[PDB]
Paper text:
Two rings of seven [name] monomers stack and interact to form a secluded barrel‐shaped tetradecamer harbouring the 14 catalytic sites. For protein degradation, Clp‐ATPases are required (in Firmicutes ClpX, ClpC, and ClpE) to unfold designated substrates and thread them through the entrance pores.
In order to gain further insight into the interaction of ADEP with [name] from [name] and thereby support our functional analyses of the mutated [name] [name] proteins, we generated and solved the corresponding co‐crystal structure in conjunction with the apo‐protein at resolutions of 2.2 Å and 1.9 Å, respectively. In the apo structure of [name] [name] presented here, two distinct conformations can be differentiated, like in a previous crystal structure of [name]. Five out of seven subunits display a well‐defined upwards pointing β‐hairpin loop and downwards facing N termini. In contrast, in the remaining two, a structural inversion of the first nineteen amino acids can be observed. This inversion leads to the loss of the structured hairpin and the respective N termini are facing upwards with a slight tilt towards the barrel rotation axis. The residues E9 to D19 form a loop that extends into the axial channel and, in conjunction with the terminal residues M1 to V7, facilitate pore closure. In our apo‐[name] structure, where two out of seven subunits are in this disordered state, the pore is effectively closed. In apo‐[name] residues 1–19 are highly flexible, dynamically alternating between two states. The first state is characterised by an ordered upwards‐pointing β‐hairpin, stabilised by a network of electrostatic interactions between E9, R23 and D27.
Residue numbers in the entry:
A (entry chain G), D (entry chain D), F (entry chain A), G (entry chain B): 2 to 192
B (entry chain F): 1 to 10, 17 to 197
C (entry chain E), J (entry chain K): 3 to 192
E (entry chain C): 2 to 10, 15 to 192
H (entry chain H): 4 to 9, 18 to 192
I (entry chain L): 2 to 11, 17 to 199
């Protein structure tokens, strides 16, 4: 039992939705995996389609993710800012790395976490191999990527870039209350 | 009219047939994929009817704590009561979810087992990195024990002692512990 | 390759896999090892059939080498829990937890075909780690064996002491031998 | 190109069958692989379905199989004898081991092979590992299983148990004509 | 709902299935039990639809299992309709055997198609007596293939034995001359 | 991982589209992978289909790709140029190597990047093995391929061949604004 | 990865086509992979299907292929020649080895390449292992195969067999214009 | 000749008629110990030999090469269990000169039934089963002779792993004395 | 009592026999094991005689930079002149050691190859960790180039440019570059040692 | 597992492996692929033999499929540099860099046994990476080929142009063909 189906019956007969497609009808998108190009391609396409249907109505992005690719993360980030409707973000379980970046990327006032959800922030990870000059190019690129991430996190959270740099040097785990205090979300969702 | 093909396992599978009657079947380890699916089913069922009970059958060795908390928080968040029924085994995060069902509506069948223990994990790298990971797991244990204490009526101190090692409980022991409310006996089939 | 059956209804054609087609006639096919996935499916089918009709009999065919004891117990308790009588029919082999489920069918409604085999034995497992962790695991499996033997005793009429001796090692039984044992009620003659 | 689809257009629409499901509609079952518990489950289910559709019309079981599991073979064997319709057996290509046993299990007068089909008989195979007494138990079991197979073969072919024992000590390949002479089949199907 | 239409494969109406509507069977792989069972099934279905109209079997195959090939061969002989055989690309080993097995006057190859004939291949492991049984079996299987090829080509068993000792590649024209096909299909 | 479905209800039917096929209905093509022959075959086919539906309406090509095969990239490049509609290009996330080549291949005035999308340019990569003569043939071939690539990029950007050669000697990472200044795109799309 | 779908309103209801089956309605066949027996089976099937639809109208074969099996290539080659419709060939990206052979195989005056498409010609490749007499048989066969390829290529291009032999001794890469001058194609399609 | 611990330390003890078994019993180990036993007899056919045993056992045939060589030679072979003597290890410990079988106070002994495998035809499985059952009968008979226990008791006591302390091994008759410091 | 003689070990091998004549034979990659052995040989030879020349034959694709510096620093540290002779190839740290020989005593045979390029490395982990690894390899390159400048007479600027990619030099080009002092030709066999 | 030879010397019994015993008689055995390790050993043997006697001939037996060009040149240059003549004797096969070393023997003292084989071809290699890197590797291997052909031309008396043509593909020569070519001076009669 992985992904169940929901049947609706209308004057056109039966139609079948997988559970995620059923929620998409209600403008809900689930980000529930590692972020890669396939995942970003999917989320981007869902956002574009939802705007096409209605440019005024809110979209709800549920986030349970350990992060992943920074550029895939930025394809989702930029699409969210680009479209007309507000995108609410809701953290369930865990938002780490690029996942926590996307959580912070929701419409101001509309970023949430459930009470026992975990938020983790840290610096980007990568690799470099080859000649000294090639390692230099790769190091400069990851350093500039970190600067870009911190700059945006500063705008979204209200914290200084200096504070962001210090707090992301090592793995930094926050509770839902701490994430609110930090400025990564706006509210902890009460039962 | 168009009718959706029906199957036991993948189309309209046996689990989707139960979902129509507001039953969710957990029969695997808890990972992010399973949690995201269960969360989605829970949100779907609330949207269909905010008042009617939901039924969550649990046979699970447990798994990810964060994936488990995604389910846990969704259950508390939603309006309908979620009944939990242990069949076979509920271990680790599986037992945590069983204990999280609506008060008075947490059940086990007579030969089902319940296992409670401490969270497991790993760390590698620098002394400072191991420290951060140790602190994180210890805080995760404190969070789990605090909630179990609230849901069982057992003290935090007692939970800590009883979970130091693998602790197997019968259905009756689980009831006495406060993990469940009632052992469902075959004699009361017809009430 | 699981075959499809298409049925005509007054509002259109419906495709079934062969197993869902038999499910329409209240037949459940167990033809594999018992694990959490298989137990989830069998339990789901049992609950579905109870919800369709709480009075009509269910037919559970069993060809299984066994598997997880906890997964087996999920099925066992579900069978005891539901209102309908669950008939059990052994075809091929019911071994270990498979034979436990065979014996769990409704009294008078436990069958084997003439050449079907039954095997009973003690539970299998493992433990790794500290002396204390090995002790917890040994006590648990020993308690599990007592539970299995107690229920088997009640379902077969054999004493707990006899069950213990007979399950010490692999014990292969013919369909007639299983009937004599009290694991089934009748051998189904063609 | 593995498994093609056939389309039939009816008064109330269009219906699509894979080739094997199309033949099943004409009471034809294809046993075309090694016999295991999963193959047996599908064959038994098809036989049970066909009897429920019509309890008197013949069933046709085509066999191209190297054989496999004895107990899975017996699930099929016992189901065939149990149901009311006559089950015709037709060897195409090869029937070896448990496949040749099932070929001989067809309704008397209705067991066939095509002229160039190959039939092989031999003693059961297996294994045993562990303590001396465990090896003894496993040896006693396979020997008793061989006795059971030989006894039924005797009933089905008219050959003595003594002859079957000798003729199956090692791999014994038979032509369609030799299989008829042996009593494994009734007729060689001539073009 | 209508099944989706695709080139290659839910369930789907692929290009091969669309040809099967016109009584054409496409063999474009090695011959194993799965391929054979599907082809046998297609032949039985086509006979049941119409027992009079011709069937067309295109062959591009390196061969494979001899028993799987005989499952196809015997089904072709068994059914009422004529089965035309058409070699495209290559018919090797059991593939060339099936090419030769088409209806008399209705076995074809395209001009640049290749045909290869050779002896059966196999293995044996174990006791001396077990190697002997395996050896006798493969030699009998060769005898069976050569006798049938003899009837189907009009070549003597002696000549087939000699010509199949090693890998023997034939052009479409050489295959017609050999009696494996009846005609080379000219554009 | 599952791709969501969108069901479009028409007058007398229902169309169940996967999200990508739903966008294609609105003349949107999503390039969200490495470029290889299979991806090129699909993109080219989508372009041909869209031309056949309407030869005048714009097409939208979203690009999030690390590039890949040069020849496969040229199959797409030449198809874009061949067809009558304007193909707008929109970089989201990253366009690297052949991905950045296709980005620059869009209709003039209609090449775009989102604010945080990354663009990378570098020289072609390959390999050669065997005899001295064979290595010579492969070296000359890859050198001629680089000359072809640089000449086209020169035409598309307005930069000289000499400048492109220098700027592509090593991995060269560009921001969206830098990509605009370079002439690879025409505009950075602001929210 | 996933092939997009086109859905159209038809006399039998809403009909879904993969992008390639939709193009098949315009008599377009897309070769975008290595040539093996399965690819050949598919391409031959499409050619036969299109002839059955209409025996007079032209077919358009797009070629992006690194080549592959010579025998599979000849199954396609002979099918192209056998059928009544003219088959137009259009090189996009790369036509190498058997790919370039199929490109040259198109209807006289209807063989095309897009401006940046590449063509490569060389001799057949193979292998031989075993006894000296077996290596002899394999060598003779591949030499005979090369003679066959060169004779046909001579007929199709207008070049002498002697010139083909020399030009194909090693990997020989050609631009679209070079391929035209050679006689492999008739025209370069300018945008 | 150069000397190392690992002309080694074992070579030095062999001069004083000491043979060290501190590994699993396989054909290579058996060949070495047999060769050492034959060498010591050739040096002096009357003087005692000392065999130290710390072994989890191993091959039954390899163990029987050693056992039969002990019985064949003229010198008494004292056996001294250190650490653990399991399976064929405990068999060789019990095989020492009567009255000259020893264990150190914290040494362990384990007895159980032989282990094996079988794969193939029913007839082949039967031959292998009959073989291992005969092997067990041979081991149990010899163990009965060397301990004073009945064949019936040995059979019951070796059905599963049976761990013994040094004192328990003495009471069982596998050794004669537990050595005092 | 006499030590057994062999060409190569599985005993007094061929390299040990040449070591008696103060010849050290480098014919492999430079790793720590090779470096520790060569350093040990140099220290031994100095202890035998602090005056007499050492002869280091080099046929090496190079290897570990730190291992190469263990050898380099030992050469400079000891009293005797170490002659270097390139046979076959001296690449990367191999070419660095060739250049490290006693001034006036660095040779290549006529068909030997010399290759110079930049150091190679790797980094994985956090952005901060990649930065540390990059800075370390860049400083390592500066160090190598500085020493090559001093030993060849070429400017640091020239070496940087010339080592950006693989740069293959003939024996004569290596002389012209200042990596060696003389191409040892067969014609001088009898007239010169 | 090389056999040992023991000899009485001026102050005691000394053991040699078969190869170091032959080395006493100024014989070096090449019977493998050429790599840096093999070259280190061959070069070392040649330097040792020069130091033992600078005047007496050395005998190099060659059975080798070739291998590293640079490792081969280490050997080639050492031969040309040392004072004594190096005789070369081909047994079995001298292929690629092996046939180059065979041709490198003192002129008049290059031999093959009657059934020995000689093979000549162009250098083999590879390159991965950027277009610029592939160019550097291609220029390098082409320059390496020109160097080999120039020396072969000098050693054989054949033109560079003929050598280029004759080495385009694998070219197998009998012992008599290798003499005619100029790779050896004589085929040794039994």
């Amino acid at each position: 039992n992985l992904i169940p189906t929901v049947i609706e019956t209308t004057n056109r007969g039966e139609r079948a939705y997988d559970i995620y497609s059923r929620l998409l009808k209600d403008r809900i998108i689930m980000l529930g995996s590692q972020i890669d190009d396939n995942v970003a391609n999917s989320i981007v396409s869902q956002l574009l389609f939802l705007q096409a249907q209605d440019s005024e109505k809110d979209i709800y992005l549920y986030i349970n993710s350990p992060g992943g690719s920074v550029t895939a993360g930025f394809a989702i980030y930029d699409t969210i800012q680009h479209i007309k409707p507000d995108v609410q973000t809701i953290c369930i379980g865990m938002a780490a790395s690029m996942g926590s970046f996307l959580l912070a990327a929701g419409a101001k006032g509309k970023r949430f976490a459930l009470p026992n959800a975990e938020v983790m922030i840290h610096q980007p990870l990568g690799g470099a191999q080859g000649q000294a000059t090639e390692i230099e190019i790769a190091a400069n690129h990851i350093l500039k990527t970190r600067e870009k991430l911190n700059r945006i996190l500063s705008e979204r959270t209200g914290q200084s870039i200096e504070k962001i740099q210090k707090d992301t040097d090592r793995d930094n785990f926050l509770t839902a209350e701490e994430a609110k205090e930090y400025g990564l979300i706006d509210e902890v969702m009460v039962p």
